[PDB]
Amino acid sequence: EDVEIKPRGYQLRLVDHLTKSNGIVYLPTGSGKTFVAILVLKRFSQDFDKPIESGGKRALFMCNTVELARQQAMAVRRCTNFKVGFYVGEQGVDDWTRGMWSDEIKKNQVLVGTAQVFLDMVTQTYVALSSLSVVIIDECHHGTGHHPFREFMRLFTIANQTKLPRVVGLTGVLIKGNEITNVATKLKELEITYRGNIITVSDTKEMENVMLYATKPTEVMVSFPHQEQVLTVTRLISAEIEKFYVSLDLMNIGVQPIRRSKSLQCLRDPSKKSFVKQLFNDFLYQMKEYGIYAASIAIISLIVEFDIKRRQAETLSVKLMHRTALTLCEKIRHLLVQKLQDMTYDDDDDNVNTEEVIMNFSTPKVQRFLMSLKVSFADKDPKDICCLVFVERRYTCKCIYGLLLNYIQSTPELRNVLTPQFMVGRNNISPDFESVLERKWQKSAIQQFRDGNANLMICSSVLEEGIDVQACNHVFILDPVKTFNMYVQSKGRARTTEAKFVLFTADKEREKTIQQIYQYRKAHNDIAEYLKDRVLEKTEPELYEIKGHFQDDIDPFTNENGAVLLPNNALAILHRYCQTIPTDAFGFVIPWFHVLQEDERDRIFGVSAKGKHVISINMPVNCMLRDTIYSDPMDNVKTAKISAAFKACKVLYSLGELNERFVPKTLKERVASIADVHFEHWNKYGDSVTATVNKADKSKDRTYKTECPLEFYDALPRVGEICYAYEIFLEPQFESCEYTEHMYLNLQTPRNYAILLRNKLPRLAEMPLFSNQGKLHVRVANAPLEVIIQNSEQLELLHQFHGMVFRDILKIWHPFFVLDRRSKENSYLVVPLILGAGEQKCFDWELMTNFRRLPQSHGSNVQQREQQPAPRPEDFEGKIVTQWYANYDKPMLVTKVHRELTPLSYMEKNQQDKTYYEFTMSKYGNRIGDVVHKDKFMIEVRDLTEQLTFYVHNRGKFNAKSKAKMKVILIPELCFNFNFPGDLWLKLIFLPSILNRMYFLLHAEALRKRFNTYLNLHLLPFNGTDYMPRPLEIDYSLKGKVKPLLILQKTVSKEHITPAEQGEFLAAITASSAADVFDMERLEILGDSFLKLSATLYLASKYSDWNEGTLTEVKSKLVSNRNLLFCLIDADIPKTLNTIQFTPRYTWLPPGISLPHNVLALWRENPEFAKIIGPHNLRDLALGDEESLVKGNCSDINYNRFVEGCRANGQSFYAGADFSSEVNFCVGLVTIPNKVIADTLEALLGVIVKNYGLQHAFKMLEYFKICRADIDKPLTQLLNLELGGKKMRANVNTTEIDGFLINHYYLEKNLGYTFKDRRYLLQALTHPSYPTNRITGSYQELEFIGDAILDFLISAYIFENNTKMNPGALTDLRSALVNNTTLACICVRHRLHFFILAENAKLSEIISKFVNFQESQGHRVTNMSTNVDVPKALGDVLEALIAAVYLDCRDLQRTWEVIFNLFEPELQEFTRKVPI
Amino acid sequence: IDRYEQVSKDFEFIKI
RNA sequence: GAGACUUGGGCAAUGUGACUGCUGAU
RNA sequence: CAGCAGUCACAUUGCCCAAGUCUCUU
RNA sequence: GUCACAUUGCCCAAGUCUCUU
RNA sequence: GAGACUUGGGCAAUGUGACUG
């Protein structure tokens, strides 16, 4: 600020002595005691920036009032280089944590705040007390009794009594109270309080030059008569005033809580009844004291305040009483103005008439006040006027202000010079007279006075202490002086020179006033006599003084971490804790105190407590303990009360109850409850309720292992068992055309390949397979054919046949594979069946006995062909061939036989006038000398497809393949022949696409059986069932009354329960990445919506004593994808999910073939070699044929090769490379992201709710241990789940309903649902701003559940009624149909805005302007002109009213009927273009 | 009582 | 009446916390 | 996050008024 | 809960060459 | 029936922007 801050002549030695020991300074106001405190901070500014944990310290600046806190904050910010923390209640301090407190302590080197804030900071031990270098105490004269200064000062004894912070006391007046006789008996109390000696400037005479800044004003007094004369009209008005008192005593207002005297004596009237009595008593006091003209404005104040009270009244009963009081006050005003107008007939000079009427009706005291002001000012300059006027009461201030305006306006000599003002203490009265409460004046009257706008200051005792004001030139004390400190500070408020102090006294009480003033003078002179006469000695060794002074009260309580509970602070914390209970309709949230009767002291504690009072504490009806606790025997009622409160707090804390931090105890832990009541299973996976992951996709992509279905494990047949053979049917769907002759005829042939199983199979429904020619429907035989392995060689031949088929005919093989007969995971055999005896098919042993080694294509020379016999034409019909002269080993399928053609063949389109013999000599004459069998036989052939994954739907199109294709004819002896028939080859191509659906179909059947067994559905359509064929999910992008919803129709009836088709479960299994015609995604939306509804309803039913915010923030974690993943992992489901898109050539392991067993052992049992061997090492295991097909293990060379593969990876750039991506399929491992697992969870939920209804789906949700069962009763239906209480139901009877429901039938005429209990409707229409919220609540709780209800109903309707919309647009329209704006449009169209109850400034106009806008626009849905704000309340009103309608009957069908009647036009308008 | 009793204009600011 | 203490209504100042309501910006 | 405003409970210092009890003076 | 723009995989329309005579 | 190849169209998994409740 400035460098003129050089200290005064006294402050240096003061701060010098303050370092040696504790000290307290007594200097008059305006002497810079704040600056010497700042100097103390400067001297003790050595260790401020160092952290506490390293030994650093800080300081603490104690305060008294928030206004003085701001003043001292400004004073310390202006001239300090440190950082100050401005700490004030009702914000931050009650919500901060130890981290924020410590971090603020790290930066802030000094702190300022009110007393109780520091009390809570220190007792709760946010930081150690030793962390403070010094403590600065303002207004130290308050440091006595139960005042917070003394309470904090008590903490020094119990704390570490070493390296204690320094305390300094500042006060303009040392003593508060009238016990001024023998002032030495009072100084020592404050002295021993801080154990510091009082110090005052010794050189008062020389430093009085500085005291000129606080000059003593001259002291004069004005005496006025106090004759006991009162007018007639006062006696008149008192009669009806006391009549109104009596009548108000008979008022019929509602019930009120317990109210009685301080010492629990007989009852007292409630606040809403006694406030008006107190106000009228004060008005009568003002009228009697100051005069009739004073009452002429006091009455205006009474009307303008009763109007505010009427406007702020919530119950209707209070409004009538306030109207009666307003009428009575209007009558009082009428009589006052009538008396005034009956006077003033003497003169017509309006200014002079007003001045003389003010002079006349004024009491002599106020008259003397008026003429004293007139003679003191006498039309001087406004800058010469600066004063404070102190009166007793607030309404006195307002009334004196109001009459002073009129008096100033009535005198031209004072009109331009006086500008009065007034303000009062915490009881903030409106500073306006003629206007209702609409004022917003940020600058307080103190700031206005500081600006110089006002010159005369009217004020109550608020300005006597603390507030720093300009050095006023006058002080007028209108009311008699009553206390010493008030007199001292009032005389100190005339801080400037030539100031005048004027006191107004009565004539007949003048002598006693003079005597009292003289007594105060002697007391003030004797204040310094104790310090002047004090023997020069320290103030330190007398610790017993402090001990005795502080042990008189009740002993405190302490525990671990240093937390201490103050017995004097027990009442506040008890009330705070008891206010957090869920209140009833009129439940009481405060402990009930009842002093025991006289002879009941000994009934509990014995005769020893006859005089010692004992009082019991009664807990509320919803407290944790419903019993009562009794006080210890104490000598007075207040000490007994505080002891009882302290013991109750101790008992509550000893149970875990009373918050450790001594608080109403209850927050995030309420959650923790339900939380672990749920997320307890997270701990075994390394997660918790407070733990979240947001980095490196951790807990987002997890590795899983797969298990074979229950019907393929150990399915390998053995010798001497009844084996089962299920043949495969392939039904051609595409028509027989030129391009589809073979694919139809050879696929309809009886010869089929079948599976040999040691176990049974269920009935598997037909599914389509899309190939190049079109679609093929595959069905498995329902009844297997029983066969027996009658010889070991037969089984060996069958297994070799399987192995060589998989090795060659499909080329689905790898060098490191081994023919497996030991491992039982997904192990089975496939065999061909042919007619041996009758229609039944036995083993086609001709195939197995021949095709142990597939015919190896080889070149034939002319000499060999000369020795080769001529092949018959039937030797190629239906067989497989391939050309050996060409380098291509691809097979060739014989289509048409040629018995009528010669090698010198006919003409063709390309080789016109050319024969096939000439063509083959020209093209491949290099490796053919001549055709020796050049007659009577060629073959017409066509190639076969190579694709295996026949899942793509559109790969089979023929629109562009309809064009002309060449006809290909080959010469027989130049192409090598296979005895294998292409008839079986064509069907055998489709085998992997059969197996990779049979796997997951058996898995889905197992899941269906599990979810039909747990839900005890074992009825007729579930054992002799016939499964409908595979459906096609078209929406996968690969090409008045109401109709009852099908989702809920199967809830009250059992005939409508559709059997759970295996196709639905299979779709719930297959993920999006599987690249198939069906998916889980559509059912995912419905499952999610059902999960949301169930979670919201369950939480709102079990916890009807919570708020919607806590319910939402708990159901968020309950429904979060993190919860669903861990839940379904606990369900051990993931082994039965379809994610990969069936890459057969690389990753789909053959069933009965796997890599060598020793590799499995020493690469899966060893963690050090878990994923070190890469695919580059595996492919090098080109084992021998006997080493792979019979022996089953690897040789020594291969052993060294694959044991050194990992080491070679660790010695090359391949070290650290990922060897888990699609190269870990050997052990069946799969990497699946959480978005798949969760979506499958609610996909299963959606399938279950679709097929079995809401009730069975909710019952199944219990199986996933998400909806935890209640101990009293396990669970009930989704409907009839009894929920409600004091927040979902109105807490008033039927009589009070009509007073809040002005019209109900007019809402019924459009809603259509006759309410049988209007409490739900009232609770839905109750806005938070409405006054009833404090005792009844608001519509938020009903809105919370109505949202979910509407969301699920709309989602179900758009799901079932539109079968071919991707979840996208489907739920996208949902958002358009659940948007807030369209809900408001619905509300305004049906005119529900009439009945909505709310009280707010904008809200009054927003609804009207929006309904006017909608009417002008013809109810046009925005989904707009001049940015009109949408009234978001109306949408929430609908969201709560829907829930209110539902709860009145607990039926969803009626709710949906009402919703459809409401939304009929929107569900026909939005479906066209779905506006976004 | 018909009306208040008027008080003298003059007085003294006597020292106390 | 002094002194000790208590009751009850009454006055002024101080402070906490709970509940809900506006308004603007992010 | 900030501004303004409303309702209600509890806590502390001090103050006069009335009534009552004891010690004590008369 | 859903949409638009930048990266893989599947299925087509155009046209071209190779392979099947 | 298939590959090679380019132009465009269609579908699903990652990054940005924004809307509804």
Residue numbers in the entry:
A (entry chain A): 2 to 1040, 1169 to 1552, 1602 to 1654
B (entry chain B): 344 to 359
What is the paper's account of this structure, in its own sentences?
In Drosophila, an RNase III enzyme Dicer-2 (Dcr-2), aided by its cofactor Loquacious-PD (Loqs-PD), has an important role in generating 21 bp siRNA duplexes from long double-stranded RNAs (dsRNAs). ATP hydrolysis by the helicase domain of Dcr-2 is critical to the successful processing of a long dsRNA into consecutive siRNA duplexes. Here six cryo-electron microscopy (cryo-EM) structures of Drosophila Dcr-2–Loqs-PD in apo and in complex with dsRNA substrate in the absence or in the presence of ATP were captured, illuminating the continuous conformational changes of Dcr-2–Loqs-PD after binding to dsRNA and translocating until forming the active dicing state and cleaving the dsRNA substrate into an siRNA duplex in the post-dicing state. Loqs-PD is a cofactor protein that comprises two dsRBDs that are responsible for recruiting siRNA precursor substrates for Dcr-2.
